[PDB]
Design a protein around this ligand. Sequence first.
Ligand code: 62R
Length: 95
Amino acid sequence: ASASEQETLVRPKPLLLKLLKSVGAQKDTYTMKEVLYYLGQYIMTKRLYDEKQQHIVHCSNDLLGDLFGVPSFSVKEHRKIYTMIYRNLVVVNQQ
Ligand SMILES: CCC[C@H]1N(C(=O)c2cnccc2C(F)(F)F)CCC[C@@]1(Oc1csc(C(F)(F)F)c1)C(=O)N1CCN(c2ccccc2OCCCC(=O)O)CC1
């Protein structure tokens, strides 16, 4: 039913929802594009990167690390990022 992969509708699981809402997300249902956007807002506000290597997120002592299950990851490794995000949501229908 989704018009594109980025437009897949999802319901974040409770802790990922808590995380997204902490950075101004007002929804309960999001597109995958929106989840990436709000994760980005979270990383930027909490400064979860080293100014030296901006492509590496450091999250070992943060909820982001607990939910993704890693102490750090590369923003370039999209496959790994999708895998970690998917474990924290449920796919929903357009109704
Ligand atoms: C490039 C300028 C915005 C990104 N930014 C920096 O890269 C950046 C800047 N200055 C200092 C430090 C950083 C740091 F984030 F990398 F640590 C700042 C925040 C928004 C920003 O990055 C991320 C959003 S969600 C995310 C993460 F959880 F880590 F995976 C990273 C961003 O919105 N995206 C767009 C989404 N990307 C992504 C990631 C995974 C899969 C597919 C992706 O993309 C597909 C195509 C885009 C589309 O979804 O339609 C990753 C980058």
